[PDB]
């Protein structure tokens, strides 16, 4: 189930959130498939971090991205995992 996901709209939505929608809607629809499933929701967030790690070449941009990423389930109307390592 995890291998099948298209999290590119989440990566697009987050980096535009850092610069300062079509992708916020599409991102929440993708994340909705993991609602109230903590292990699988965490892997989705981790895979967004994994793909974006090379592109965050600065402490302040990295922390804002992490912060916005931790708030992404809540801002989509979903529960975040109790624990999810983003390092």
């Amino acid at each position, epitope marked *: 189930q995890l291998e099948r996901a298209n999290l590119r709209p989440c990566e697009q939505h987050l980096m535009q959130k850092i610069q300062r929608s079509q992708h916020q809607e599409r991102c929440c629809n993708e994340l909705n498939e993991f609602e109230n499933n903590q292990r699988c929701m965490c892997e989705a967030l981790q895979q967004i971090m994994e793909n974006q790690s090379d592109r965050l070449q600065g402490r302040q941009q990295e922390q804002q991205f992490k912060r916005e990423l931790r708030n992404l389930p809540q801002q989509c109307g979903l529960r975040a*995992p109790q*624990r999810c390592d983003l390092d």
Partner: antibody
Amino acid sequence: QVQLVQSGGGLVKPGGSLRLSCTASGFSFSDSYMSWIRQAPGKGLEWLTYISGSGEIISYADSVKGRFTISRDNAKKSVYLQMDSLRAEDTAVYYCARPSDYFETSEELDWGQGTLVTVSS
Amino acid sequence: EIVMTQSPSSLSASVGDRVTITCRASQSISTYLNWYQQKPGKAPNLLIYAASSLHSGVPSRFRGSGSGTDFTLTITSLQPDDFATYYCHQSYSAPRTFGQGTKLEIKR
């Protein structure tokens, strides 16, 4: 290395007010929720309130809504609990708690030493 | 408030026994159920989070199971350090709520 150092509390008359404070180190305070939990003498744990890192999300248990106020100062790495209109029921040990991670669902993990609050005339 | 209903309220058992504490939630709380141990005068210690996951350092004899409304903490072989009070705890939705607690005493 996580440290939670509480302060305040003590003896107070019914209807009076106390401000409990808790200062935290060893983690990213500004990203973490913080919560207050109490335990009256010989009774069970009673969850009271929490506050998001920004301070924009706040929740109060029904037993305390309208009487207590939680706040935080991220620059001071501190979380506060203003208790007003106290009652004899409120006599308890009050615990500061930090959750295990930086989400709104993260469960309490590290606890302060506890502060005894006694409400009596 | 999500009401958490623990059973039993008290329990006597001997070293080596298999103990079971249950926690029933007022509504579906998914897997967002946590278990704490508290000894007198001390702050609670987290045993289990996410209804099945052991916190680092917690011995393997503690095991959690369940999803939805009904949850269980199991102690496969009770040890001398296990006599304490045990609480369930939901972080599914705020305000969070503890169960009433379960005091685990020595049988004789």
